[PDB]
Amino acid sequence: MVNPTVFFDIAVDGEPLGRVSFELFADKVPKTAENFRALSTGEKGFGYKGSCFHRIIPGFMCQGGNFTHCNGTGGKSIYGEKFEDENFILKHTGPGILSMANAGPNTNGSQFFICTAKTEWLDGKHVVFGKVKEGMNIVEAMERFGSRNGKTSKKITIADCGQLE
Numbered sequence: 001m002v003n004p005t006v007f008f009d010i011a012v013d014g015e016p017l018g019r020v021s022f023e024l025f026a027d028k029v030p031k032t033a034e035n036f037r038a039l040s041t042g043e044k045g046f047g048y049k050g051s052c053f054h055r056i057i058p059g060f061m062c063q064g065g066n067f068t069h070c071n072g073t074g075g076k077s078i079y080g081e082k083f084e085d086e087n088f089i090l091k092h093t094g095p096g097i098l099s100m101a102n103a104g105p106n107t108n109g110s111q112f113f114i115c116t117a118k119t120e121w122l123d124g125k126h127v128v129f130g131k132v133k134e135g136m137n138i139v140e141a142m143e144r145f146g147s148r149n150g151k152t153s154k155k156i157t158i159a160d161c162g163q164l165e
Contacts, residue, residue, distance in 0.1 A: 001027050004163060006040040008048070010138055011159040012145060020114075020135035021164060022098055025090065025128075031079075032086045032100060032108065032129040038078045039065070039110055040161045046076070048110070053156040056146025061119065062139060063101055063150070064158070065111035075110030083108050090128035092119040096139070098130035116143055 003026050010017045024033035039047040046067060053064035066075045077083050084106040092099060092115055099122065101111035114132065116139060132139060145152050 002165075003027060004033065004037050005133060005165040006037055006163050007161060008040070008158045009160040010053075010142060011157050013154045014157075014159075016159065017141055017156075018135055018138035020138050021133045022130045023133050024098075024130040028089050029086045029127060029129045031083065032127050035077050035079065035083070035108070035110075036098075036112065036129065037163060041163050042161075044078050048158050048161050051075075051158050053142060053152065053158075055113075055150035056142060056152050056156065057148065057150050058143050058146050059117055061113040061115045061117075062142050062146065062156075063111065063113040064156075065101065065109075067110065077109050081109065082106070085127050086129075088124045088127065091123045092126070092128060094118045096132035096136055097128055098132065099126045099128045102126060114139055116140070 004024050007019050007021045009019050026033035051067050053062050055063040069076045095116050097115040100108045145154050
């Protein structure tokens with residue numbers, strides 16, 4: 001069992017900030033991990049490259065993953081539009097947790113968030129599927145471009161992304 005690793009190269013109004021890498025917990029949440037992995041490589045013809053982190057709340061999380069598709073602008077999964085919550089085995093235990101955004105039960109698409117703190121009130125509500133490996137410093141730098149309501153002060157985008165291992 002060897003879990004895949006993916007990376008994002010982050011930019012601030014196009015100026016390179018740095019690389020964040022993630023372990024995807026395919027051993028626990030294979031369906032969810034695979035969605036994020038494929039969106040990161042762009043292999044289905046759509047994905048995270050060029051997308052923004054549109055909601056960043058200091059001390060809480062950085063949210064991203066929207067892109068244009070035939071039926072909208074807030075992203076979609078590799079399984080059609082939405083998919084079920086796979087399981088809630090893993091918890092939002094601390095900084096660096098990678099979890100799925102949603103609009104209630106069984107509404108996972110492409111949007112995701114990276115926690116910058118323990119967020120236990122999300123346990124059982126959002127599917128945790130990965131964690132930051134390298135580049136937590138870069139996530140902390142992203143956080144400085146957020147605000148209490150989540151609006152970012154500069155455009156925080158995924159300049160490049162893909163699979164490392």
